[PDB]
Coordinates of N, CA, C and O in Angstrom, one line a residue:
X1 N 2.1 3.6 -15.0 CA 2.7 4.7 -14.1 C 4.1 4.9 -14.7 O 4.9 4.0 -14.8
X2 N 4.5 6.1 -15.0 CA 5.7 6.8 -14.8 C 7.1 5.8 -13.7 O 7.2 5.6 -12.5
X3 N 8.0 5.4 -14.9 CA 9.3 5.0 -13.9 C 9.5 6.7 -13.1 O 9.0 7.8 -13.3
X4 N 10.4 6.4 -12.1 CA 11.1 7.2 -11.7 C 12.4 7.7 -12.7 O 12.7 6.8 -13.5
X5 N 13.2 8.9 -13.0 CA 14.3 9.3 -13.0 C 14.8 9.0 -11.9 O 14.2 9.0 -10.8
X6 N 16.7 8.2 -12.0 CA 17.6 7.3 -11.3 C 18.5 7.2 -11.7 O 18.4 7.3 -13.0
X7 N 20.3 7.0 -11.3 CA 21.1 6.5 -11.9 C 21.0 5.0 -10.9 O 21.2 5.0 -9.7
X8 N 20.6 3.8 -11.5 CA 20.6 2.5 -10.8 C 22.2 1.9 -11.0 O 22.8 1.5 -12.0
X9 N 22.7 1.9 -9.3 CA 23.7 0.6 -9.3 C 23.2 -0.6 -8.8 O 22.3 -0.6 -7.9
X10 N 24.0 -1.9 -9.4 CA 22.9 -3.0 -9.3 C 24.1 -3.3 -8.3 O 25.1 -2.6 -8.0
X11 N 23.6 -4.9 -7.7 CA 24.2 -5.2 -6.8 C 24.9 -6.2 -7.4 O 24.3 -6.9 -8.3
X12 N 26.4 -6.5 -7.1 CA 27.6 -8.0 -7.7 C 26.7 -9.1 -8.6 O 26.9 -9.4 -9.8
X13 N 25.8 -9.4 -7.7 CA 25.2 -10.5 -8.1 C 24.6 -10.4 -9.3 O 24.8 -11.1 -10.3
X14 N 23.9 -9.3 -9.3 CA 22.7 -9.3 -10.1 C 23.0 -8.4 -11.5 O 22.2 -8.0 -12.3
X15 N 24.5 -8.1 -11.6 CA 25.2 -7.3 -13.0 C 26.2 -9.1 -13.4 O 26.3 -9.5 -14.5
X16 N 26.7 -9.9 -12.3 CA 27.0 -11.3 -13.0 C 25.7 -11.9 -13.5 O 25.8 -12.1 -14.7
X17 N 24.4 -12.2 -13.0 CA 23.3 -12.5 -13.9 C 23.3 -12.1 -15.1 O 23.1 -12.7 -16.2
X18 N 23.5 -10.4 -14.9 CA 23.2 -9.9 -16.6 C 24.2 -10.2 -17.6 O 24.0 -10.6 -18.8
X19 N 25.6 -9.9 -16.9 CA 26.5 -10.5 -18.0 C 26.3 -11.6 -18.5 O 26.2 -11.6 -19.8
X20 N 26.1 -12.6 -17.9 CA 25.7 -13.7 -18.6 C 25.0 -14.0 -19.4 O 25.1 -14.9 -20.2
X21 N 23.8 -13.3 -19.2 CA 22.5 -13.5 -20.4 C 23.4 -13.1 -22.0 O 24.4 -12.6 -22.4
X22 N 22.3 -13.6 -22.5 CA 22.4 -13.2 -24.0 C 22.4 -11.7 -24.5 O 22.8 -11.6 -25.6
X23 N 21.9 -10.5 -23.9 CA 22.3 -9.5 -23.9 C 21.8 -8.6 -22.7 O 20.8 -8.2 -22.1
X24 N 23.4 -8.5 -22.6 CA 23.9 -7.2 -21.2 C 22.3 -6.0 -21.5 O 21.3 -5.9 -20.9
X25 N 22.7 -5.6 -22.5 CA 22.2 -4.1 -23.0 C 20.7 -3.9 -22.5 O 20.1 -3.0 -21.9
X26 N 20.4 -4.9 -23.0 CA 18.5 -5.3 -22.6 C 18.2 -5.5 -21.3 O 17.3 -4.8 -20.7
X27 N 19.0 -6.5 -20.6 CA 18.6 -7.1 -19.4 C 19.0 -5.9 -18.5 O 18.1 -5.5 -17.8
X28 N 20.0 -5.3 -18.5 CA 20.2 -4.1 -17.5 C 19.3 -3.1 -17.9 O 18.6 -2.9 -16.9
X29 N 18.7 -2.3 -18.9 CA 17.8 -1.6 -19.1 C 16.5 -2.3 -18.6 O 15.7 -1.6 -18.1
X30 N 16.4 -3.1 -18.6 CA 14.9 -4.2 -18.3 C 15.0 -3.9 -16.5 O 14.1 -3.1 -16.0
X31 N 15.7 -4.3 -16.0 CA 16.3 -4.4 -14.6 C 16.0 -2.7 -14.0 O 15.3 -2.2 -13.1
X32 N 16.9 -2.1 -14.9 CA 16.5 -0.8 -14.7 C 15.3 -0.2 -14.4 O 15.3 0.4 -13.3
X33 N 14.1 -0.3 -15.3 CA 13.0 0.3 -15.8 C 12.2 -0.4 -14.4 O 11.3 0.2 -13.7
X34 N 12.7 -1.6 -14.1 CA 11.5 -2.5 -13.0 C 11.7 -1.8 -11.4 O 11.0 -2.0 -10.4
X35 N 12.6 -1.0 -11.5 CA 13.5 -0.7 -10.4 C 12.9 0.6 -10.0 O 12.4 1.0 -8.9
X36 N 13.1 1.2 -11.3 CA 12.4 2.3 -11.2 C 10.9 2.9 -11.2 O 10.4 3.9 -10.6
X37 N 10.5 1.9 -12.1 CA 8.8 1.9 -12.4 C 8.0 1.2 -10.6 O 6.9 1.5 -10.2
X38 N 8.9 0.4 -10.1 CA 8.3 -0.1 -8.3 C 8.9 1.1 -7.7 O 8.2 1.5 -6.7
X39 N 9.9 1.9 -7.8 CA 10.2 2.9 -7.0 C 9.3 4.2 -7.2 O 9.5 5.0 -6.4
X40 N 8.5 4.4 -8.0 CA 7.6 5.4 -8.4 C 6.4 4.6 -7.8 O 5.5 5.5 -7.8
X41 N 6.0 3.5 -7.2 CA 4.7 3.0 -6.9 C 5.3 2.6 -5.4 O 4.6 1.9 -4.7
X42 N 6.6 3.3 -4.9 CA 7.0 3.2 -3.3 C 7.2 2.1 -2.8 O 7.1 1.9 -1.6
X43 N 7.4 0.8 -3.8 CA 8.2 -0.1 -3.9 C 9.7 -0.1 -3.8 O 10.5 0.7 -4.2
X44 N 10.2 -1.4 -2.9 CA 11.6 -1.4 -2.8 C 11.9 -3.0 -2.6 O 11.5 -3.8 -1.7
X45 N 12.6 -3.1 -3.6 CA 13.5 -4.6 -3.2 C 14.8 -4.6 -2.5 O 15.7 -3.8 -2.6
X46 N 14.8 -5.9 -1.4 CA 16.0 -5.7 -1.2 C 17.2 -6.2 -2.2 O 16.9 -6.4 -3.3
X47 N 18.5 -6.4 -1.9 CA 19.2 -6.9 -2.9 C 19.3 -8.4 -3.6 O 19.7 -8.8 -4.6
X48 N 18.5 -9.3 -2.3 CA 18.1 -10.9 -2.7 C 16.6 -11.1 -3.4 O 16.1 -12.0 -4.1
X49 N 15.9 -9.9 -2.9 CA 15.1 -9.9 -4.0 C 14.8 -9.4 -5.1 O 13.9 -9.6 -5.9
X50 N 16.1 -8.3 -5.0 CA 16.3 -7.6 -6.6 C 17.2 -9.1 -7.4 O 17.1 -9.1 -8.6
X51 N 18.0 -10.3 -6.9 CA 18.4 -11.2 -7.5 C 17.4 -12.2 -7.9 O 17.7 -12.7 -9.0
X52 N 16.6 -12.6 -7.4 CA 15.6 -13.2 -7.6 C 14.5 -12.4 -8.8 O 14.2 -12.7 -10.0
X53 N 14.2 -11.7 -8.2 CA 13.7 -11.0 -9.6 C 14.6 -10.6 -11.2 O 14.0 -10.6 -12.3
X54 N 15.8 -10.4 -10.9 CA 16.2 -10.0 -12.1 C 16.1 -11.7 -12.6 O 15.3 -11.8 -13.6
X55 N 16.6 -12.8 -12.3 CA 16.3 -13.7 -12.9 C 14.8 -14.4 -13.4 O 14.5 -15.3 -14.1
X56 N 14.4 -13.6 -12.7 CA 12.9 -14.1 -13.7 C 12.7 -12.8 -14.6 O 11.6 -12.7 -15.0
X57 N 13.4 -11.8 -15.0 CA 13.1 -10.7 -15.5 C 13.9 -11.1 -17.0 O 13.3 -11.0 -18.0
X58 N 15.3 -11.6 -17.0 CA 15.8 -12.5 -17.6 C 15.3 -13.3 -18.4 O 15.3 -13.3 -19.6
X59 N 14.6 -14.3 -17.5 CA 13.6 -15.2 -18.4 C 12.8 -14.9 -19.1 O 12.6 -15.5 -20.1
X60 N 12.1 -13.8 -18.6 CA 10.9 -13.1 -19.4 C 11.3 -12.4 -20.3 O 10.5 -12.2 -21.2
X61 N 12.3 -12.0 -20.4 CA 12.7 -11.0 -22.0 C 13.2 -12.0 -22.6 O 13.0 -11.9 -23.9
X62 N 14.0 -13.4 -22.1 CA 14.7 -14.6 -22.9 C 13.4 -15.1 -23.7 O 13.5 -15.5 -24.9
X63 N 12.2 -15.1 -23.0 CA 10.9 -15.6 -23.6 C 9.9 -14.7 -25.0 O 9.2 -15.1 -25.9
X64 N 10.2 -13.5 -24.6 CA 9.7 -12.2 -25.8 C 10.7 -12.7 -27.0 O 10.1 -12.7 -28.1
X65 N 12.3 -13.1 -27.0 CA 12.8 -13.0 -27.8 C 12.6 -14.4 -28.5 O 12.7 -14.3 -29.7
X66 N 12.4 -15.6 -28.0 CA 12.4 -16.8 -28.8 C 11.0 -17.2 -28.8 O 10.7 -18.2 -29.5
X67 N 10.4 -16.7 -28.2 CA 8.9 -17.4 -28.6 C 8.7 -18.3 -27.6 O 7.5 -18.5 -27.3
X68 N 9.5 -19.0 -27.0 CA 9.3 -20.1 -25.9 C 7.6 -20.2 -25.5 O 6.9 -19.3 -25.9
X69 N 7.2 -21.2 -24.8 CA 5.5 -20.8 -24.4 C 5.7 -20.3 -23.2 O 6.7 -20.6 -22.6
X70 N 4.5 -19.2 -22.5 CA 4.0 -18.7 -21.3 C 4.1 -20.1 -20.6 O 3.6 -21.1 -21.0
X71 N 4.8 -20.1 -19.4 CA 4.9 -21.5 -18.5 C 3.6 -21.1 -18.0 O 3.3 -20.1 -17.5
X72 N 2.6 -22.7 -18.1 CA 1.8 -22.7 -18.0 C 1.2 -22.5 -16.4 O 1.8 -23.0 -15.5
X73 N -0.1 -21.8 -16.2 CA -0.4 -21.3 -14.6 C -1.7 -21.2 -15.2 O -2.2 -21.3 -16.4
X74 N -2.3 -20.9 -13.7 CA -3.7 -20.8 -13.7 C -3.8 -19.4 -12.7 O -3.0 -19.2 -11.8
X75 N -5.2 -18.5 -13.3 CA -4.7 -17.5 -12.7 C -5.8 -17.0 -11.6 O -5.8 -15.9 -11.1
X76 N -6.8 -17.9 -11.5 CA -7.2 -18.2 -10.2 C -6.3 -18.1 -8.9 O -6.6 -17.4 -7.9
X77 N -5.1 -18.8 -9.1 CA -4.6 -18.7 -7.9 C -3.8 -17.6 -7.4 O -3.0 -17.5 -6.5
X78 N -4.4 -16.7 -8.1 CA -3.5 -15.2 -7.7 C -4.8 -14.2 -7.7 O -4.8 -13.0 -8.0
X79 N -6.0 -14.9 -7.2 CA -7.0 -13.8 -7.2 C -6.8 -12.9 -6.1 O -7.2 -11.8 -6.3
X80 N -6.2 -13.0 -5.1 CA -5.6 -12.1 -4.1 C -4.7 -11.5 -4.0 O -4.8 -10.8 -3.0
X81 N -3.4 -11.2 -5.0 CA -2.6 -10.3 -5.1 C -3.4 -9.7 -5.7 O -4.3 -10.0 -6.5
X82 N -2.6 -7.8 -5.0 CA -3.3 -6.7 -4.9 C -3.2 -6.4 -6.1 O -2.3 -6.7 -6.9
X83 N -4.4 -5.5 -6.4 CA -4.5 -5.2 -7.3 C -2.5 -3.9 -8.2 O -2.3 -3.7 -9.4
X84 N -1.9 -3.4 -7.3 CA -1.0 -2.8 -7.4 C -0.4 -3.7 -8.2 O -0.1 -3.5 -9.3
X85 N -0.2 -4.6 -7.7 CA 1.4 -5.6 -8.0 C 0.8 -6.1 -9.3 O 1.6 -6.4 -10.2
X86 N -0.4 -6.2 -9.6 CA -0.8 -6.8 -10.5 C -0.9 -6.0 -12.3 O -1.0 -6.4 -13.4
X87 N -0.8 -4.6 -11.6 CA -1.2 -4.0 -13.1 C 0.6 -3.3 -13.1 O 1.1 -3.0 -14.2
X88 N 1.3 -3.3 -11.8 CA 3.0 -3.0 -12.2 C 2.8 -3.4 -13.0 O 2.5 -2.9 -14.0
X89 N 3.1 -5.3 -12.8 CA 3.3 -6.8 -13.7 C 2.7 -6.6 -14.9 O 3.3 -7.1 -15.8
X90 N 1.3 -6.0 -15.2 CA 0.9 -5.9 -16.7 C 2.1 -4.9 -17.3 O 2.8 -5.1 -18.2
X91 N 1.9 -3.7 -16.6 CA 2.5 -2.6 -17.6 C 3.9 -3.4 -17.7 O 4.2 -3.2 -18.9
X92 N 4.9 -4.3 -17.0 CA 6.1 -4.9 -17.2 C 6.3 -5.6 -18.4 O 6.7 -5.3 -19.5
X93 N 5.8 -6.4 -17.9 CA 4.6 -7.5 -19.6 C 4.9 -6.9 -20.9 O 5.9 -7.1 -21.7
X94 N 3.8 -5.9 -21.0 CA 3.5 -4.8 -22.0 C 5.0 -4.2 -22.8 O 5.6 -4.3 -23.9
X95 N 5.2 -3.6 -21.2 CA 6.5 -2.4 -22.4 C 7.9 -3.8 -22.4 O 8.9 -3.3 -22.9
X96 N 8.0 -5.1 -22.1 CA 8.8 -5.6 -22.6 C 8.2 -6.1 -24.2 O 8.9 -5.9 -25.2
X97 N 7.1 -6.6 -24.4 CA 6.7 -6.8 -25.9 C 6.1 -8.0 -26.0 O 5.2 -8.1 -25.1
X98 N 6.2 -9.0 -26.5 CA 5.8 -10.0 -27.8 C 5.7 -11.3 -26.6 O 6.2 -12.5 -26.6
X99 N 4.7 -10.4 -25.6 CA 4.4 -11.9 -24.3 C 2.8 -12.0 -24.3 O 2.0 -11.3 -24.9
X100 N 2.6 -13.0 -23.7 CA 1.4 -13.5 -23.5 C 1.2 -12.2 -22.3 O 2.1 -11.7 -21.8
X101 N -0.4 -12.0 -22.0 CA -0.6 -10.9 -21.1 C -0.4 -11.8 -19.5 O -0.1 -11.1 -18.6
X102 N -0.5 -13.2 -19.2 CA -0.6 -14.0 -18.4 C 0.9 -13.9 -17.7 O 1.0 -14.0 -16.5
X103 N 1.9 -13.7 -18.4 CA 3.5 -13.6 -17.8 C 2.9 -12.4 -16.5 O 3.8 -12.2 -15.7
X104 N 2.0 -11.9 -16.3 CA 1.5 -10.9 -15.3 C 1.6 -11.7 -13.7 O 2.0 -11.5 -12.6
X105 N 1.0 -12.7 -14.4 CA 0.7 -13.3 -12.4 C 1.9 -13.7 -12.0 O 2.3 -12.9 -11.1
X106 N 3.0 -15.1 -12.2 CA 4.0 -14.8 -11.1 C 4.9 -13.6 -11.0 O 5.6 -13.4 -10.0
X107 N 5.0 -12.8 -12.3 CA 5.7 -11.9 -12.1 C 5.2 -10.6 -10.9 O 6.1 -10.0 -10.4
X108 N 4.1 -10.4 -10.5 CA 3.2 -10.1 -9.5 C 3.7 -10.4 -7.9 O 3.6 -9.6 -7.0
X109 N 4.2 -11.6 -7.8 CA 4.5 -12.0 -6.6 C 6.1 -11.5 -6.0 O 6.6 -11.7 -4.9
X110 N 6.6 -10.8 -7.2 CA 7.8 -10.1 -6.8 C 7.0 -9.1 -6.1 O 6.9 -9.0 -4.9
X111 N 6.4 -8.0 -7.1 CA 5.9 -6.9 -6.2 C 5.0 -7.4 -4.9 O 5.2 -7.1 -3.8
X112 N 4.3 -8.2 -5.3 CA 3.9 -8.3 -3.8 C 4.7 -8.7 -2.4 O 4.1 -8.3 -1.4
X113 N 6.0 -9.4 -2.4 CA 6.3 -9.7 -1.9 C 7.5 -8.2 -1.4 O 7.8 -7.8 -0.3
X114 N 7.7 -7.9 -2.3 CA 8.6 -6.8 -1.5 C 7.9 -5.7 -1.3 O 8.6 -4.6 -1.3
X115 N 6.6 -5.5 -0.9 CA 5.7 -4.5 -0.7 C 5.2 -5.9 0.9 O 4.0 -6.1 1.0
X116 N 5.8 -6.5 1.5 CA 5.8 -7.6 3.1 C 4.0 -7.6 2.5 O 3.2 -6.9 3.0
X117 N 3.7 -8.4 1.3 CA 2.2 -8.5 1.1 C 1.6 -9.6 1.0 O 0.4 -9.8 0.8
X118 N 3.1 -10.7 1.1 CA 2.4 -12.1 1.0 C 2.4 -13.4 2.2 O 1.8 -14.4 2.0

């Protein structure tokens, strides 16, 4: 799906997360695209779960860039998140790059949860 068109302001928290990472540039464009790409599927985080999410969003681009392994999961246990949250989390996956397709399932439980689905 199509992100939305947006000027995104982030919340205190969650622009001190990005400063900190290894690069501003990526992580706020990353943050961005997630913001907007759930806002086009009528998704909305609030701002403790746009913090929680950007830090796993963090991790997962920290993981495309060094190779780290897919923390290991089984993906049985997410046979019930909706199918929505589930193909966001692929296309997220995807247009960040050089991930296992599996980074899909906990990343899933963000959208699910801020769509009151879990």
């Amino acid at each position: 799906m199509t992100p939305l068109d947006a000027n995104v302001e982030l919340p205190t928290e969650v622009k001190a997360m990005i400063e900190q990472s290894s690069d501003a540039q990526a992580a706020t464009a990353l943050v961005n695209y997630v913001i907007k790409l759930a806002a086009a599927a009528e998704i909305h985080f609030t701002d403790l779960q746009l913090q929680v999410l950007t830090n796993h969003l963090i991790e997962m681009l920290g993981r495309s860039k060094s190779g780290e392994q897919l923390p290991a999961v089984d993906p049985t246990m997410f046979a019930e998140v909706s199918q929505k949250s589930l193909d966001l989390a692929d296309q997220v996956v995807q247009h960040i790059g050089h991930l296992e397709v599996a980074e899909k399932y906990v990343l899933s439980i963000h959208f699910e949860a801020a769509q009151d689905k879990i």
